[PDB]
């Protein structure tokens, strides 16, 4: 029995293991929706207004995941300002702040979750009122500074109540440079939905050609009326890949008002000169769907979910939740012995 002090590592391993099992048991039950497209100037923007208008859910917890981001923005902003004070040789209006400045470097490692004693708040209020700090803020175009720096520091009263709920505009302000992804953790009909709006296309084919597999649904955005043959080639390559034989393609033909006007004035033949149908929505949409689905050639079933949509009043949540439920049911029956 070579257990000597060692019969302690196993116990640790079993506690870590239990933790890994518990997060894992909960996860994987999430319904994940992947949005792709953006092959145009503004597709995901159209997606964003439809999301704003027809999608919601702001529990306390989703607002809470932005707490660390708010704090990090604030701390990094004040750090940037202080460092610029050192760089530009700006002195305190009152030499007693030199003591604050020593504390400042200490309180700068105090950047933990939600340390907002009245003393720190007063130090920040005093710095923000300083003329050299105001001078830096008004010269912020020469360095990097959140545009909302003054907005928040001037709003500390509103910001510090424990019932603060970030607005939608607050979220829009959360700064995104090169990568995004959109997340929500709302509850609805006892299902936890997770919806992801991704862009970055026109070049990231390799990320979906094989990085995705097992996802619940694809949402493919197409610019109806906004080179083109290369797009058909990319879709052919992705669409017909043997590893994606069993994955559903769901199509939201968006900007339908402009498309309906364009097909009145712009023939479908610009894209497909061999098209002999009429320039009605139904025939042109059916023809496009046919051209895409014909690229498969290796699948007896289709289960394509086609939708007929209207204006800003369209009951979207009913439509989205019915489609989620039918796909989950058919995907639960497919592997329960019944067929």
């Amino acid at each position: 029995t070579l257990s000597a002090e060692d019969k302690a590592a196993v116990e640790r391993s079993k506690m870590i293991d239990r933790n890994l099992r518990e997060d894992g048991e909960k996860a994987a039950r999430e319904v994940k929706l992947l949005l792709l497209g953006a092959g145009e100037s503004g597709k995901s923007t159209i997606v964003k207004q439809m999301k704003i208008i027809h999608e919601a859910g702001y529990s306390e917890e989703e607002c809470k995941q932005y707490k660390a981001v708010v704090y990090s923005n604030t701390i990094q902003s004040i750090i940037a300002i202080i460092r610029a004070m050192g760089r530009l040789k700006i002195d305190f209006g009152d030499s007693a702040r030199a003591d604050d400045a020593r504390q400042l470097f200490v309180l700068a490692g105090a950047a933990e979750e939600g340390f907002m004693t009245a003393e720190l708040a007063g130090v920040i209020k005093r710095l923000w009122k300083d003329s050299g700090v105001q001078a830096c803020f008004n010269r912020s175009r020469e360095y990097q500074l959140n545009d909302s720096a003054a907005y928040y520091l001037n709003d500390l009263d509103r910001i510090a109540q424990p019932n603060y709920i970030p607005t939608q505009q607050d979220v829009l302000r959360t700064r995104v440079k090169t990568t995004g992804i959109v997340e929500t953790h709302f509850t609805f009909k006892d299902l936890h939905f997770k919806m992801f709006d991704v862009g970055g296309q026109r070049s990231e084919r390799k990320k979906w050609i094989h990085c995705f597999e097992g996802v619940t649904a694809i949402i493919f955005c197409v610019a109806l009326s906004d080179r083109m043959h290369e797009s058909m080639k990319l879709f052919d390559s992705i669409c017909n890949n043997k590893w994606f034989t069993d994955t559903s393609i769901i199509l939201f033909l968006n900007k339908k008002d402009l498309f309906e006007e364009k097909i009145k004035k712009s023939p479908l033949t610009i894209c497909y000169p061999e098209y002999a149908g009429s320039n009605t929505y139904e025939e042109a949409a059916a023809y496009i769907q046919c051209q895409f689905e014909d690229l498969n050639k290796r699948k007896d079933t289709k289960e394509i979910y086609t939708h007929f949509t209207c204006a800003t009043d369209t009951k979207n949540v009913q439509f989205v939740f019915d489609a989620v439920t039918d796909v989950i049911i058919k995907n639960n029956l497919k592997d329960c012995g019944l067929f």
Binding site: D6, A9, V10, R12, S13, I16, L20, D23, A27
Partner: peptide, 20 residues
């Protein structure tokens, strides 16, 4: 994709760390 980075001591078969 469980969101874990695990470092194991392969000699004993113990996970040393699971990083979220």
């Amino acid at each position: 994709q469980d969101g874990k980075l695990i470092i194991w001591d392969s000699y004993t078969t113990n996970k040393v760390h699971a990083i979220p």
